[PDB]
């Protein structure tokens, strides 16, 4: 039972910053790929960003230059720093642990930005 812990969201005024975290535990076969996805009520899963074991970072055009992903090799965890927040980012975000077979999916943290 590979388990993913996501934390660090909530309500933040426009222009604020937050840092969400996913800890992947269990099997998580070494050549894994951890990604972040967006879903606002009424829309689909929007690919926010992706990082592989190669250390390469891939970001979408929606949040150009605003969101960053950081890796922790010792615990094999991931933290996205979401800064310069805009009301268009009001959506629940989820983790995509590609692993090497049984793709895992997240539990969710609410991200709200409005004034």
């Amino acid at each position: 039972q590979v388990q993913l812990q996501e934390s660090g969201g909530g309500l933040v005024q426009a222009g604020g910053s937050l840092r969400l975290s996913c800890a992947a535990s269990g099997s998580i076969f070494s050549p894994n790929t951890m990604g972040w996805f967006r879903q606002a009520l009424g829309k689909q899963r929007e690919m926010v960003a992706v990082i592989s074991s190669i250390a390469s970072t891939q970001y979408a055009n929606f949040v150009k230059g605003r969101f960053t992903i950081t890796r922790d090799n010792t615990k094999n965890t991931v933290h996205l720093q979401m800064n310069s927040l805009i009301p268009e980012d009001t959506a629940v975000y989820y983790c995509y642990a590609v692993d090497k077979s049984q793709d895992y999916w997240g539990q969710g943290t609410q991200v709200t930005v409005s004034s």
Partner: protein, 50 residues
Amino acid sequence: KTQSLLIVNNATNVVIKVCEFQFCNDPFLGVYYHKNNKSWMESEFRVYSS
């Protein structure tokens, strides 16, 4: 993906281990006797990859 329990009996004792073994399709113990004694039988464990 899941925890597994492993019992083996070699010529000397029992090995009971509870870990996350990556079992292959055909686990086994390769047995060979020594060239002079043949009283005991040496085992090479080919049960799990990791």
